[PDB]
Design a protein around this ligand. Structure first.
Ligand SMILES: [Mg+2]
Ligand SMILES: [Mg+2]
Ligand SMILES: [Mg+2]
Ligand SMILES: [Mg+2]
Ligand SMILES: [Mg+2]
Ligand SMILES: [Mg+2]
Ligand SMILES: [Mg+2]
Ligand SMILES: [Mg+2]
Ligand SMILES: [Mg+2]
Ligand SMILES: [Mg+2]
Lengths: 74, 134, 72, 59, 53
RNA sequence: CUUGACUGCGAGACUGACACGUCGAGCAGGGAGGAAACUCGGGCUUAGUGAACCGGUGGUACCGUGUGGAAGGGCCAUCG
RNA sequence: GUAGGGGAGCGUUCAGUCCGCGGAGAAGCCAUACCGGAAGGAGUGGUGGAGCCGACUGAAGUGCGGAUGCCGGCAUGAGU
RNA sequence: AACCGAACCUGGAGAUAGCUAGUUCUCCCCGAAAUGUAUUGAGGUACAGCCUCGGAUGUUGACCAUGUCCUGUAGAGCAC
RNA sequence: UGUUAUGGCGUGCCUAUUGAAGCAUGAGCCGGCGACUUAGACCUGACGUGCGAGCUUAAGUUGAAAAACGGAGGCGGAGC
RNA sequence: GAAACGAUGACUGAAUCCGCGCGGACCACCGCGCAAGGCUAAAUACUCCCAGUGACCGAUAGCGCAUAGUACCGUGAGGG
RNA sequence: UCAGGGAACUGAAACAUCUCAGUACCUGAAGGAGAAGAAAGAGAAUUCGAUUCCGUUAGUAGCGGCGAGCGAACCCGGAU
């Protein structure tokens, strides 16, 4: 049979070198792809959200683990 | 002279004739020509399904009498029970209430039906009296 | 045609499903909504002269317990 | 329309419309506690445009 | 949240002297006799809640 | 070991035509675990669902048609 | 440049003013090589025989190729 | 009473008609849409999206370059 | 200006359409009739006018070649 | 519907002035009223008809009719 | 004008309550007019004081598959 191409959404909401706010949603993910770095929290759905205001740090280690951080802009 | 009498200069435009216009055939091609049924509201679209009750009452309502109004201008004619109609509260239908908005020190004595806290706390600190029905 | 006043003059007929309830039902709802009629009985009496005519059961009671413009 | 008065179509002082949150009202609950307090204040101004017209003259 | 003949249940809730409705989903399967928990009523909060009824 | 499968709230964002939906630092009443930093407003996440309306049920005391009460209604839960 | 929106206007009946024209002849009808960016508007010539332009303002039953549209008149099929 | 799966006439009555057909005087300025979602919805309708006029704002637009990150297609490869 | 001979060019109009010279609808021809209106102390907006933190009257009364009176009431003025 | 009150169709069927009906379930206070008997211009409605006027028509308009419900159609109602 | 009787198409984008609407039609009685009337009342001031009519209250109180929709009265201003 066939049914349901699903809407979902996902993607990475706030990209690198972008200035965010406290409360903005940075990444919408499913599992843990992007680990919350310094300045960054992770919701129960593993959504990455911002604790404080500042600039978006992307950290690439070879993946498997990589990090969304927030460093101050000021 | 009536014949030299001019127009309003831009009060009205002429009306709208849909006869002629060489390629006007009006309204919408199908569907929504000819009907008297158009009707923007209705229970169909997102009004019902909307979840409220509360309950309707709207009881006693009072004349809002600005403090700024009372003070500043006029004489302090000692408003009281009659002259007040000429003071532009004009309602009838309802009793009168006094609330605090503008600030100027004045001795004033007024008969209204009720007042707010900082209203009486205002009128007296500048000196005066505010009466209430017994 | 009765004695005092008149006859017939009738009402419509209502009937309702979800009949009863818990008095505090969900609601009562309707079905019938049709027109209806009314009538009475006739017996033989006379006044001023011998007649038969018709007798309203109320006025039957009345004529029986007293002679107000009529006798049996 | 004249039904919608006590239900919230309600109009503000800025000529906006009060429509908040329906998420679950009476039947079907037993999820969380603040979805239950999820009942809000709120609105949108898209369908507020023709909303007031239901309530129009009686503010 | 649908209901019928089935197992488990949605059982109502109350406190010692305090008046509050938790209404949580219970289950008669493994064990249900004591519905006893600790929940917080009108004012005092801080009480044991017997949801057994 | 326990009843955070909490109450009163939401800075700010994801998403949707709308209605819904989603995540969420943090303030307070307060709790539970830990020596402590601290964590907790259900569950690795993603499905396990349904607007309004009419009604059943517990709580609160606003409306209640001359006035004082009650009937009925309203609001906070909540069941269908 | 199609639905659609915006702007300027042309022409027609009625009405109030204004200016007037007409038996040495009104409107209407007929022709016409002129005028105007268009709707349109004049010039003269022929018909007519009792009335009518121009200007301003206002009001409309106000503009037709269609609707197997309506009333009428007259064609084609045919000297069949 | 010359068309009877319910006669004829007058009437309610301009029945309703998400259907079809038609909708006339000029020029000027712009200028679409047949997508998305919901719909006893599918040739219909509500909201959005795209058109126009007016106001406010006042380069935020547009392309192109530099910087910065995100993506797993083409290719490829055989490490599951 | 009228008529003409020759050359070049040249797929009625409308409607309905993804698409019409269409072998898809309509229509014999010419008159004349013929379709976005009217109403309400309604709702909302644009332009214009009078007063302006005020603004207005309705029924009705009285004069009526002519219009005045009539503040019952309505709308601003406070919100949640 | 918590449904008061008027109104009757069927069964019932009280008081009478330290009395009776009402005041929107019902109770008490507190008010308002006194049913079972009748008549009663005026201000209101309409236009067969007569008068006067009209930004009403003027011979496909205006009433159907510049007189005709006649001719003409139908058994008739009716149409015209 | 009052009275006895009383539709449906239609709206609810389907349809039973509902709306159309006590509308159309039938019938009965009467006049130039009718109807209605001299509070067992409105009404919440211990005000008003027969009926009808206009304004207004007011789309307000309220009615309702609380859907489509329907929609008062007192006060107050009058004609009388
Ligand atoms: Mg068409
Ligand atoms: Mg021959
Ligand atoms: Mg032949
Ligand atoms: Mg032959
Ligand atoms: Mg036959
Ligand atoms: Mg028709
Ligand atoms: Mg055409
Ligand atoms: Mg097209
Ligand atoms: Mg053809
Ligand atoms: Mg051909």
């Amino acid at each position: 049979n066939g049914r349901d191409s699903n809407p979902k959404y996902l993607g990475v909401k706030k990209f690198g070198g972008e200035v965010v706010k406290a409360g903005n949603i940075l990444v919408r993910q499913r599992g843990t792809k992007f680990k919350a770095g310094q300045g960054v929290g992770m919701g129960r759905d593993h959504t990455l959200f911002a604790l404080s205001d500042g600039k978006v740090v992307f950290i690439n280690k070879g993946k498997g683990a990589r990090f969304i951080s927030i460093e101050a802009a000021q | 002279g009536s014949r030299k009498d001019r127009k309003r200069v831009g009060r009205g435009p002429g009306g709208t004739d849909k006869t002629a216009g060489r390629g006007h055939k009006g309204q919408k091609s199908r569907s929504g020509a000819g009907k008297g049924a158009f009707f923007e509201g209705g229970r169909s679209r997102l009004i019902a399904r909307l979840p409220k009750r509360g309950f309707n009452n709207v009881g006693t309502t009072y004349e809002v009498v600005k403090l700024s109004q009372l003070q500043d201008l006029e004489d302090t004619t000692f408003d009281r029970d009659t002259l007040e109609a000429y003071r532009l509260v004009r309602r009838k239908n309802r009793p009168v209430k006094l609330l605090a908005s503008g600030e100027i020190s004045r001795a004033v004595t007024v008969h209204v039906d009720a007042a707010s806290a900082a209203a009486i706390k205002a009128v007296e600190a500048a000196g005066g009296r505010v009466v209430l029905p017994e | 045609t009765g004695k005092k006043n008149l006859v017939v003059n009738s009402v419509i007929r209502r009937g309702k499903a979800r009949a009863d309830g818990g008095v505090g039902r969900k609601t009562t709802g309707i079905t019938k909504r049709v027109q209806r009629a009314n009538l009475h009985k006739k017996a033989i009496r006379e006044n001023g002269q011998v007649k038969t005519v018709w007798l309203s059961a109320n006025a039957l009671r009345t004529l029986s317990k007293g002679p107000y413009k009529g006798i049996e | 329309t004249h039904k919608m008065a006590k239900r919230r179509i309600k109009i503000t002082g800025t000529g906006k419309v009060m429509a908040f949150k329906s998420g679950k009202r009476h039947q079907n609950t037993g999820k969380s506690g603040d979805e239950i307090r999820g009942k809000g204040k709120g609105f949108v101004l898209a369908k507020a445009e023709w909303a007031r017209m239901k309530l129009m003259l009686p503010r | 949240a649908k209901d019928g003949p089935r197992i488990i249940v949605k059982m109502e809730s109350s406190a010692g002297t305090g008046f509050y409705y938790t209404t949580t989903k219970n289950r008669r399967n493994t064990q249900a006799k004591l519905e006893l928990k600790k929940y917080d009523p009108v004012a005092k909060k801080h009480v044991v809640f017997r949801e057994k009824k």
